[PDB]
């Protein structure tokens, strides 16, 4: 797809919420554990994501994720539109299970699993910077 | 400098702690507000940073930041060494003050200020991906 397209979804694990952003063209992932599955957490996460990468459009598998006033406000300010042109969430949950006993906190296992996914082979982390630099 | 070198420091504002990571060769920044200025917060932040970028060595202006058992453990697992070869923290505090009234929460102003710094002109965000892709 286009180099500005990202997909955001939440998954549940251990009674906690993991927000997962996937750069669609590359397979590169950012993820965080958030306390509540709310618009404000999504909005804040979008602000962080857009200061780091050139985010043009965002997609989701649960469209009601984006009806927040706060989400719309974050997308407005960062100049993000909704992607209309369109499972690495399962692989990530798989890597988390593989490392989970290595960490006390779930959020630590998540970041270990993001690390492994992005540097596993080129890797998704190498592909994203090549795609963005070329563009 | 080398494309794997990052500098981590905390600043204080409104009685809160802002962890600031600077990619030295490019001037690109990641930042978060953390509750406490502790080793565990630094360790977790390093894990996140290293899953996103190829982090080889980290520098700091307060060396005692890195004496944590947890920090050493994060650097060990992510394969990060201490940089021995070596103020955008003030510019960032300046941009934060410029936007602070736009946001209820400090952490939101921080991310607005990271966004502005990284896309201000090439921009630091364009330079980091070119440097990393070339390398
Ligand atoms: C990441 C934080 C610090 C927020 O939480 C860790 C966790 O959830 O396990 C955590 C770690 C730690 C640090 C880096 C690390 C790993 C574990 C796993 C692989 C990647 O790199 N270490 C210790 C500990 C400190 C003193 C002695 C023995 C262990 C922790 C102690 C209490 C709570 C979390 C710890
Ligand atoms: C980012 C979060 C949501 C965690 O906190 C914001 C803040 O700290 O100001 C926040 C925002 C918001 C959202 C996006 C945004 C800005 C502000 C500033 C520029 C960049 O994009 N909006 C509202 C609000 C919601 C309904 C109606 C009127 C405003 C907030 C309401 C309460 C607390 C924080 C809000």
Task: Report the C-alpha gap between B109 and B97 in whole angstroms.
Answer: 8
Q: Does the beta-carbon distance from A112 to B77 stay under 8 Å?
A: yes
Cβ-contact B70, B40 below 8 angstroms: yes
The conformation of residue A35, written as its DSSP 8-state character, comes to S
Q: Does B76 touch chain A (CB under 8 A)?
A: no
Q: Does B73 touch chain A (CB under 8 A)?
A: no
Q: Does B77 touch chain A (CB under 8 A)?
A: yes
Residue of chain A whose Cα is closest to the Cα of B126: A133
A72 lines ligand 2 (CB under 6 A): no
From the CA of B13, how many Å to the nearest CA of chain A? Answer: 19
Count of structural domains within chain A = 1
A73 lines ligand 2 (CB under 6 A): yes
Question: The CATH number of the domain where A134 resides is what?
Answer: 3.30.420.10
Q: Give the position, in ligand 1's atom list, of the atom nearest the Cα of B73.
A: 14
Domain containing A48 equals 1-135
Chain B environment of A77 (Cβ under 8 Å): 112
Closest CA to B7 of B28, B34, B36: B28
Backbone angles phi, psi at A123, to 5 degrees: -85, 165
Contacts 24+ apart (CB under 8 A), B71-79: B71/B39, B71/B42, B71/B43, B71/B46, B73/B43, B74/B42, B74/B43, B74/B44, B74/B46, B74/B47, B74/B50, B75/B46, B77/A112, B77/B47, B78/A115, B78/B46, B78/B47, B78/B50, B78/B51, B79/B50
- Give the neighbor-by-neighbor strand order of the sheet with B16-23: B29-34, B16-23, B5-13, B57-59, B81-82
Q: How far is the CA of A99 from the centre of ligand 1 (A)?
A: 13
Q: How was this structure determined?
A: X-ray
Cited resolution, angstroms: 2.2
> Which residues 13-32 on chain B approach chain A with CB closer than 8 angstroms?
30, 32
């Amino acid at each position: 797809c286009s180099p500005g397209i990202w997909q955001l979804d939440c998954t549940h694990l251990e009674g906690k919420v993991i927000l997962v952003a996937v750069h669609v063209a590359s397979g590169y992932i950012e993820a965080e554990v958030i306390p509540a599955e709310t618009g404000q957490e999504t909005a804040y996460f979008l602000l962080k994501l857009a200061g780091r990468w050139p985010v043009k459009t965002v997609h989701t598998d649960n469209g009601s994720n984006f009806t927040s006033t706060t989400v719309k406000a974050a997308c407005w300010w960062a100049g993000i539109k909704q992607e209309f042109g369109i499972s690495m969430n399962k692989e990530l949950k798989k890597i988390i299970g593989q490392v989970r006993d290595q960490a006390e906190h779930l959020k630590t296992a998540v970041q270990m699993a993001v690390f492994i996914h992005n540097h596993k082979r080129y890797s998704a982390g190498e592909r994203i910077v090549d795609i963005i630099a070329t563009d």
